[PDB]
Write a protein that binds this DNA or RNA. Sequence first.
RNA 1: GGCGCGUUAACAAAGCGGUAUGUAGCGGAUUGCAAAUCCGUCUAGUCCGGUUCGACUCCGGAACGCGCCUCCA
RNA 2: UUCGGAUUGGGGUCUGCAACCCGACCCCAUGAAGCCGGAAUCGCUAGUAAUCGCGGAUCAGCCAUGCCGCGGUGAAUACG
RNA 3: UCCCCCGUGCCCAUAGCGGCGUGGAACCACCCGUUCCCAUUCCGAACACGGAAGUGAAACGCGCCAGCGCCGAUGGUACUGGGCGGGCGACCGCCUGGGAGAGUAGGUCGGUGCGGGGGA
RNA 4: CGCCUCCUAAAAGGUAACGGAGGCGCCCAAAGGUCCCCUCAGGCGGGACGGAAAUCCGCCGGAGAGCGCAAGGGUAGAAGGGGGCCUGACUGCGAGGCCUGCAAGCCGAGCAGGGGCGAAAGCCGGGCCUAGUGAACCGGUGGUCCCGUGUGGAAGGGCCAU
RNA 5: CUGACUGGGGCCUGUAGAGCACUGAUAGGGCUAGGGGGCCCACCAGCCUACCAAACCCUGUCAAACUCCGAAGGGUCCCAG
Lengths: 141, 181, 77, 110, 69, 53
Amino acid sequence: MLMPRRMKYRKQQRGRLKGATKGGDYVAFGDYGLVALEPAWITAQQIEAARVAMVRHFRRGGKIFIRIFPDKPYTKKPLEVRMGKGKGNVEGYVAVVKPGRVMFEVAGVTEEQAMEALRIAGHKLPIKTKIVRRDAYDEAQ
Amino acid sequence: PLDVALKRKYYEEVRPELIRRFGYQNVWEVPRLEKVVINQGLGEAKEDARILEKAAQELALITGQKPAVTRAKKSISNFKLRKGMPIGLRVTLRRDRMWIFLEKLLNVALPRIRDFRGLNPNSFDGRGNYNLGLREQLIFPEITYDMVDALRGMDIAVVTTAETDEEARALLELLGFPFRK
Amino acid sequence: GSTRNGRDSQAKRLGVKRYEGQVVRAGNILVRQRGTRFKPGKNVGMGRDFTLFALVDGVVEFQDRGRLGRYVHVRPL
Amino acid sequence: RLTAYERRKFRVRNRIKRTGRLRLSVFRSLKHIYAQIIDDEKGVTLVSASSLALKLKGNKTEVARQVGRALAEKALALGIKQVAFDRGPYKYHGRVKALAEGAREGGLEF
Amino acid sequence: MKEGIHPKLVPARIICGCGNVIETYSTKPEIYVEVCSKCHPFYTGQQRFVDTEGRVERFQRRYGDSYRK
Amino acid sequence: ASEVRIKLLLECTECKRRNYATEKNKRNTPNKLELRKYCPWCRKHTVHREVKI
RNA sequence: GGCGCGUUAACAAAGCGGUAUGUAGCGGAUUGCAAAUCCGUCUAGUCCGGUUCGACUCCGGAACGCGCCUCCA
RNA sequence: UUCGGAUUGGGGUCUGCAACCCGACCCCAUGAAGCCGGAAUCGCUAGUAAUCGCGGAUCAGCCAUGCCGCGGUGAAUACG
RNA sequence: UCCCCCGUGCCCAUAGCGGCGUGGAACCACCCGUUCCCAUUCCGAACACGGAAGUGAAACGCGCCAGCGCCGAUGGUACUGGGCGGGCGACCGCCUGGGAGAGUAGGUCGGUGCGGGGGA
RNA sequence: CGCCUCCUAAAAGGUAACGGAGGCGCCCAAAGGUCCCCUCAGGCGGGACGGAAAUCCGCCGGAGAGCGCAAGGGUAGAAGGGGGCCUGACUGCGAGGCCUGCAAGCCGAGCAGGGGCGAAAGCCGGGCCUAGUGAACCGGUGGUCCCGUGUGGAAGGGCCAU
RNA sequence: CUGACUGGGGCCUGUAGAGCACUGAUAGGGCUAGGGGGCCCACCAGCCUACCAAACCCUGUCAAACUCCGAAGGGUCCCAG
Ligand SMILES: [K+]
Ligand SMILES: [K+]
Ligand SMILES: [K+]
Ligand SMILES: [K+]
Ligand SMILES: [K+]
Ligand SMILES: [Mg+2]
Ligand SMILES: [Mg+2]
Ligand SMILES: [Mg+2]
Ligand SMILES: [Mg+2]
Ligand SMILES: [Mg+2]
Ligand SMILES: [Mg+2]
Ligand SMILES: [Mg+2]
Ligand SMILES: [Mg+2]
Ligand SMILES: [Mg+2]
Ligand SMILES: [Mg+2]
Ligand SMILES: [Mg+2]
Ligand SMILES: [Mg+2]
Ligand SMILES: [Mg+2]
Ligand SMILES: [Mg+2]
Ligand SMILES: [Mg+2]
Ligand SMILES: [Mg+2]
Ligand SMILES: [Mg+2]
Ligand SMILES: [Mg+2]
Ligand SMILES: [Mg+2]
Ligand SMILES: [Mg+2]
Ligand SMILES: [Mg+2]
Ligand SMILES: [Mg+2]
Ligand SMILES: [Mg+2]
Ligand SMILES: [Mg+2]
Ligand SMILES: [Mg+2]
Ligand SMILES: [Mg+2]
Ligand SMILES: [Mg+2]
Ligand SMILES: [Mg+2]
Ligand SMILES: [Mg+2]
Ligand SMILES: [Mg+2]
Ligand SMILES: [Mg+2]
Ligand SMILES: [Mg+2]
Ligand SMILES: [Mg+2]
Ligand SMILES: [Mg+2]
Ligand SMILES: [Mg+2]
Ligand SMILES: [Mg+2]
Ligand SMILES: [Mg+2]
Ligand SMILES: [Mg+2]
Ligand SMILES: [Mg+2]
Ligand SMILES: [Mg+2]
Ligand SMILES: [Mg+2]
Ligand SMILES: [Mg+2]
Ligand SMILES: [Mg+2]
Ligand SMILES: [Mg+2]
Ligand SMILES: [Mg+2]
Ligand SMILES: [Mg+2]
Ligand SMILES: [Mg+2]
Ligand SMILES: [Mg+2]
Ligand SMILES: [Mg+2]
Ligand SMILES: [Mg+2]
Ligand SMILES: [Mg+2]
Ligand SMILES: [Mg+2]
Ligand SMILES: [Mg+2]
Ligand SMILES: [Mg+2]
Ligand SMILES: [Mg+2]
Ligand SMILES: [Mg+2]
Ligand SMILES: [Mg+2]
Ligand SMILES: [Mg+2]
Ligand SMILES: [Mg+2]
Ligand SMILES: [Mg+2]
Ligand SMILES: [Mg+2]
Ligand SMILES: [Mg+2]
Ligand SMILES: [Mg+2]
Ligand SMILES: [Mg+2]
Ligand SMILES: [Mg+2]
Ligand SMILES: [Mg+2]
Ligand SMILES: [Mg+2]
Ligand SMILES: [Mg+2]
Ligand SMILES: [Mg+2]
Ligand SMILES: [Mg+2]
Ligand SMILES: [Mg+2]
Ligand SMILES: [Mg+2]
Ligand SMILES: [Mg+2]
Ligand SMILES: [Mg+2]
Ligand SMILES: [Mg+2]
Ligand SMILES: [Mg+2]
Ligand SMILES: [Mg+2]
Ligand SMILES: [Mg+2]
Ligand SMILES: [Mg+2]
Ligand SMILES: [Mg+2]
Ligand SMILES: [Mg+2]
Ligand SMILES: [Mg+2]
Ligand SMILES: [Mg+2]
Ligand SMILES: [Mg+2]
Ligand SMILES: [Mg+2]
Ligand SMILES: [Mg+2]
Ligand SMILES: [Mg+2]
Ligand SMILES: [Mg+2]
Ligand SMILES: [Mg+2]
Ligand SMILES: [Mg+2]
Ligand SMILES: [Mg+2]
Ligand SMILES: [Mg+2]
Ligand SMILES: [Mg+2]
Ligand SMILES: [Mg+2]
Ligand SMILES: [Mg+2]
Ligand SMILES: [Mg+2]
Ligand SMILES: [Mg+2]
Ligand SMILES: [Mg+2]
Ligand SMILES: [Zn+2]
Ligand SMILES: [Zn+2]
């Protein structure tokens, strides 16, 4: 499971999920990528669930690129406590993902293997996704 | 200016040979001798003794110039030393005093070193300077065994106008620096 | 938490007090700042807390000199 | 990068220009000595004197004293009395000091 | 040159055991040494000291050979 | 101020009047402070000396 | 969950911004031999991150252990 | 230390078919610990202790500072 | 009015780093000395003075070079003042006015004022 | 639970929560004034003991160092490092402003007296700056000689300093 | 006639966005100070790594308490309705 090794600040404010993706919008490392279609907080558990599913489906071969990282701390108050008395404790980490962001790539596999592995990985994620392949537009960037 | 033989020899036998070997078109291109800096990193006079006075007197006799005190720039526990305490001496020799000291070094100091086999040819700075390190102080002519109380060494910095080691090497061997093969 | 945090200090109301083209009297405070964000130009003095004040009556003028800094001048009438 | 010479020149002259007077600027080469009277507000030179133009030859300290007299004599005909002496990178001593006394002896207020 | 803190240098001679006389300026007007640059073995080419046989550690003795070949 | 950093009065040595109040560290500066200050009573500069507050 | 405290070597247990102890263990002495006794010797600061010239020691976090509180309904 | 003579480098002699593991001796160089020894423990009552040298068996040679003998110089103390 | 040099400004890298070439008649510098004024927590290195044997080697000035650095459009987009809508929500569209940052083409090895010395 | 710094705070100022992070209740007789001089951290190479790291030499290095203590702003064309002489860490004021419900808080040219440093121009009414603090009442100590209960004194008050 | 509001002109600002020059975070690869083992060998060092990892180079990202940048707006003064 991913998380930053060091942090300047333990807790962050809940920001905003506005706008299309800032960076990471084109396939850059692999041959087939999974692209987000709507914004969400993607937790570290969901990232690992998707990665392991591709590893199992890629028996022997395959190399997987994870292009998102959960750097944002996620906070929760303990059960049965009232409002107030400070911000809740850190319970996990999420990655802020906006539409157009390429989340995963794969390489070293056939086309059939890539489409099935990325399809299963998407079922582990809380958002609608699409599968893309590297094209001239990605190389033009 | 005092008629030192070493300065006389540099202008008579060394300069004409140097231009022959390297083909300088300017009389100021040929390497000159800039200064000699003698440093004594005592380190034992931090707080256990004010024995800087004994070394200052000995250094002044060897070079004719009273040396200056150098102080610690910071505190280090592993050396048990505090910032600002005196841990060395340094003297700078230029012009006639520079020539006089090197003549004694090449003639009456270096031959008195135990098991002398020549100077290190790989100690050239890489930009035309030389540095050598001494372990003994009684090899100098003005030092006798009677007034020697503790053994002390020094570092000698020889600074030249030469740009490269090969040109600084040529000046030093002709001047009289003997080097190991 | 609600025990570790909870402190702040009063706001200081810093910034430029008179802008370019305004008419000022001698002694008028022109800039409140921490350090020399703006530098004292012609007919401008600096107090011990980097406050810029006018030395004569006149018109405020601002100037940017690149690497030399930003200056505030007072041009007399 | 700046040298001790360049830092010294800036440090002395920034103090002078703060006062808003006319600055008496002195340049001292290995051979000669030169003096200008400068109005920084307009950036123009009002009067200038030197040992090169006057063909003064002798002891440099003696030469500089006569350059100060000539600059002072030139200055008063143009209605200037009050100036500020700008030593630049030079210590107030020797040739630069001799020019200042010569200017003061000629009737300059500084 | 500051005054009162530097030992004044005077013309001086350094006499070696081999009779060599080097003329210089020093704080002592007469010095005697036991070795100089004109008699030290490393300077006079080789001046082979008590060790001059190259250690002869190889088979350069031939150790007889009166035994059968 | 503290036990080591104390408050003190400066007293004119010519008319004996206390004209200034200030402080010092008595471990760093064990001896009495002596300074030249304007005395408004004497209307000139005189030596002032430290006295107890 | 709140608040307070503690973590030291073989065990029990102290002081210290720069330097234990008791009983053991080990080598010797004594003894027919073991114990007792005597002569010598000896193993360290829970972990991570800071401040500091310098941390077992001061500060922050984590883990474990201990003590008290958790009421009106 | 002109005390002390371990350790090591080098040159040699002899015995033995053969001195590397593993002999003795000579010469040169090297010149360690050791400043009278903690708790404790041993021998000895007179030609004894202490101290000095000499011979023998085994044995080519010898790791003998051991063992068995021989003589030279020669004490102190025993109240109980 | 032309050119070279010296001093002092302004604009504040399109002005800089780096590479190559060049200047001693004049100026400037290095340079020669340390008696004198002055000076080094030691040193005439620095600061200072007295000069003219030498050299433009170093420094400085002046030229060429787009390797780096800096400047940088047009077009399009993000965002947005105001006016309207959609979506369970996270959020998203349309009209009207404004409009980046990055990237691209490309530009740049400065411009200019005053004074002084010299030559044409 | 008062005070200082940053964020939240929506590009003037201001802005809440038992919102997110840290500090203060000192200090310095120089760590103050002025004049003069000087310029870092780091990296690479060389050098007796001597090293990751002591002191010395050469080269590159524009601020990544330093500035007593949190954070931010500022800063080498010094506010940083060193030295000489000094006490302006002044008295009497104070045009004009910032800030502001009040009360507080903050900056300040210039004039007079008497000075410090500097050849001079000039600077100096503490400290690179923003925390290091407490109204009034009651009382203590020094000065002043204003009041002094018929009168001269005194007791005791006032005023100025603390 | 000075007002809300509006027009023109100057100055002030660091949000939205964006970016990686600083401070932190961070994915893949290359090159390697130093690590784990290793053919080992302590006489003495290189080398092996499909196990880490400093700087550096390429590619690719993140930030309320990051900024080489930076709007729309807003504030304020002057003149005009
Ligand atoms: K899904
Ligand atoms: K005054
Ligand atoms: K009107
Ligand atoms: K960055
Ligand atoms: K406006
Ligand atoms: Mg929220
Ligand atoms: Mg969010
Ligand atoms: Mg991008
Ligand atoms: Mg949450
Ligand atoms: Mg809460
Ligand atoms: Mg929460
Ligand atoms: Mg995204
Ligand atoms: Mg050189
Ligand atoms: Mg906090
Ligand atoms: Mg607090
Ligand atoms: Mg607040
Ligand atoms: Mg406030
Ligand atoms: Mg505030
Ligand atoms: Mg402002
Ligand atoms: Mg101040
Ligand atoms: Mg001046
Ligand atoms: Mg006072
Ligand atoms: Mg225990
Ligand atoms: Mg202990
Ligand atoms: Mg014990
Ligand atoms: Mg025991
Ligand atoms: Mg035992
Ligand atoms: Mg027993
Ligand atoms: Mg037993
Ligand atoms: Mg026992
Ligand atoms: Mg109740
Ligand atoms: Mg001996
Ligand atoms: Mg054998
Ligand atoms: Mg011993
Ligand atoms: Mg003895
Ligand atoms: Mg026994
Ligand atoms: Mg008997
Ligand atoms: Mg034996
Ligand atoms: Mg010029
Ligand atoms: Mg620019
Ligand atoms: Mg003299
Ligand atoms: Mg040149
Ligand atoms: Mg285009
Ligand atoms: Mg564009
Ligand atoms: Mg555009
Ligand atoms: Mg909008
Ligand atoms: Mg719009
Ligand atoms: Mg908006
Ligand atoms: Mg809008
Ligand atoms: Mg538009
Ligand atoms: Mg743009
Ligand atoms: Mg643009
Ligand atoms: Mg350029
Ligand atoms: Mg309160
Ligand atoms: Mg308070
Ligand atoms: Mg706003
Ligand atoms: Mg504003
Ligand atoms: Mg604001
Ligand atoms: Mg409110
Ligand atoms: Mg409310
Ligand atoms: Mg609370
Ligand atoms: Mg709050
Ligand atoms: Mg803080
Ligand atoms: Mg605190
Ligand atoms: Mg406080
Ligand atoms: Mg003090
Ligand atoms: Mg201070
Ligand atoms: Mg200061
Ligand atoms: Mg800094
Ligand atoms: Mg602190
Ligand atoms: Mg700061
Ligand atoms: Mg700085
Ligand atoms: Mg500088
Ligand atoms: Mg001072
Ligand atoms: Mg006074
Ligand atoms: Mg008020
Ligand atoms: Mg004033
Ligand atoms: Mg005065
Ligand atoms: Mg002050
Ligand atoms: Mg602040
Ligand atoms: Mg503060
Ligand atoms: Mg205070
Ligand atoms: Mg009351
Ligand atoms: Mg009262
Ligand atoms: Mg009272
Ligand atoms: Mg009284
Ligand atoms: Mg009455
Ligand atoms: Mg009466
Ligand atoms: Mg009376
Ligand atoms: Mg009274
Ligand atoms: Mg009274
Ligand atoms: Mg009173
Ligand atoms: Mg009062
Ligand atoms: Mg943003
Ligand atoms: Mg940007
Ligand atoms: Mg991150
Ligand atoms: Mg990497
Ligand atoms: Mg980003
Ligand atoms: Mg964001
Ligand atoms: Mg961003
Ligand atoms: Mg910030
Ligand atoms: Mg931002
Ligand atoms: Mg009107
Ligand atoms: Zn000789
Ligand atoms: Zn008085």
